[PDB]
Amino acid sequence: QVGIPKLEVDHISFSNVVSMMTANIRTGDDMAVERVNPDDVRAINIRNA
Amino acid sequence: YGAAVVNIDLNRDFFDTATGIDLTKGIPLVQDLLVPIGVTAGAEQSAEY
Numbered sequence: 001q002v003g004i005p006k007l008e009v010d011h012i013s014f015s016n017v018v019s020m021m022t023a024n025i026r027t028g029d030d031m032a033v034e035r036v037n038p039d040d041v042r043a044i045n046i047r048n049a
Numbered sequence: 050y051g052a053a054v055v056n057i058d059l060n061r062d063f064f065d066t067a068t069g070i071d072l073t074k075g076i077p078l079v080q081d082l083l084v085p086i087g088v089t090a091g092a093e094q095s096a097e098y
Contacts, residue, residue: 039089
């Protein structure tokens with residue numbers, strides 16, 4: 001076990017293990033859902049709960 | 050000596066289109082009458098009948 005920068009002294013250390021994303025994360029292929037609307041707006045349960 | 054099928058329509062000559070009845074397809078079928086409300090473009094036929 002070790003100090004733990006922060007939970008220990010103050011020696012600002014200058015080198016860490018930063019974990020990062022391997023490559024851009026927001027590249028195209030934006031989700032897209034198809035929508036079907038009820039076809040009667042008069043036979044729409046609504047009841048229960 | 051050839052006839053094929055012999056249905057029993059509903060005498061088109063009596064139920065003339067002076068009774069707004071378009072009778073070809075087989076069944077009666079007046080146009081605007083007990084139409085349903087709140088439905089897509091079609092749907093106005095299950096009961097146009």
